Design a protein around this ligand. Structure first.
Ligand code: HEM
Ligand code: HEM
Lengths: 106, 106
């Protein structure tokens, strides 16, 4: 991961992520947990959300690289429903996204 | 709606609902909102959850009858993902479920 465009990352997040996740402090859970302070904690630890994926639940320490990898696969499992478009296949898109996400969060 | 078996309703909820919803007080959100005090408020009002369905968001006053109807359709939309098994087709199953849910909640 190498910093990119926050501005474009914002538009990736609004159009690809926001329909399941919010990022502002104290923001609400949706199908996905609120992501505020995601880069200061581990996986599967948002207050007031209960997780499903075994790997998330192991509490991975989130960093840029781990997250890029998490977002690489275009499809993700949504509990009780099936697979959904939960990632960004283009490495540049990931870098943009994560650059925005680091700022919007914390 | 006519009261049924709480015991069987519990097993319907554990096996058909729990994978997206919790019911205890202060319990966490998952893909679905925590359902505690659902029969004392309106639709689309759980603290700390943000909703998608337009109809939910209109804030329907929840009662037994409205809920039975909500659960009738076997498939429900899960935002960003698709349709999922979000209901109970058998009217007796609904009555059992709702009888448990009234108690577990509040
Ligand atoms: C590129 C867009 C997206 C981003 C950046 C994103 C980010 C994340 C992150 C970082 C987590 C981990 C939360 C944690 O460990 O605390 C996560 C979990 C989750 N996200 Fe996303 N997400 C995206 C798209 C989606 C979409 C489209 C959906 C639904 C259709 C979704 C639903 C979920 C769900 C349900 C979880 C919890 C998984 C589980 O408990 O097993 N996300 N998301
Ligand atoms: C018979 C089993 C189930 C029951 C009793 C149940 C109950 C409910 C209730 C009462 C609501 C309305 C919440 C509110 O207005 O505050 C709701 C919303 C929801 N439930 Fe379920 N549910 C069931 C199964 C499912 C399943 C299987 C899933 C996912 C695969 C699910 C996901 C959701 C979601 C995402 C919402 C929020 C809908 C939106 O915002 O558009 N539920 N559920």
């Amino acid at each position: 991961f190498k910093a990119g465009s926050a501005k474009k990352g914002a538009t990736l997040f609004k159009t690809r992520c926001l329909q399941c996740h919010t990022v502002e402090k104290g923001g609400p859970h949706k199908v996905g947990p609120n992501l505020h302070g995601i880069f200061g904690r581990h996986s599967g630890q948002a207050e007031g959300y209960s997780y499903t994926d075994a790997n998330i639940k192991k509490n991975v320490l989130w960093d840029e690289n781990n997250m890029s990898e998490y977002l690489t696969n275009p499809a993700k499992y949504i509990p009780g429903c099936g697979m959904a478009h939960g990632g960004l296949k283009k490495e540049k898109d990931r870098n943009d996204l994560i650059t925005y996400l680091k700022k919007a969060s914390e």
